[PDB]
Design a protein around this ligand. Sequence first.
Ligand SMILES: [N+]
Lengths: 133, 10
Amino acid sequence: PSYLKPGSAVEISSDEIGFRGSWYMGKVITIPVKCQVEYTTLFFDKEGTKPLKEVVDMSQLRPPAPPEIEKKKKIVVGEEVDAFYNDGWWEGDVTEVLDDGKFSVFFRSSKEQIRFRKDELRFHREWVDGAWK
Amino acid sequence: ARTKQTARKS
Ligand SMILES: [N+]
């Protein structure tokens, strides 16, 4: 797997409860099936002296989400997005498009309902067998 | 300064 090389940028996912629907940013540290990653945004300590490292499943990893027609495109009610929240990307569904150009996003998993600015949203992508979508 | 404890939703 080309992207899984030590030093490579990856988005990390969890099967763990409370982390349903999130991609956090990170890099590979070692590959042996499980491998070791270092989060970019999470730390062991509240003081940020020690980047969080974990052993996860390759199933759980993926390349950095693909990157100007893409970002200028409008967001619609019903579009699947990731919202940047708690320092990672969480998938929810756009429930409302607001007058000031903000958006209300429903998170099916946590029953949360949160408003965001466009700069806080990216289009949701899926990574399937080496391909995006 | 985000931690797993203050990042988890559950
Ligand atoms: N995580």
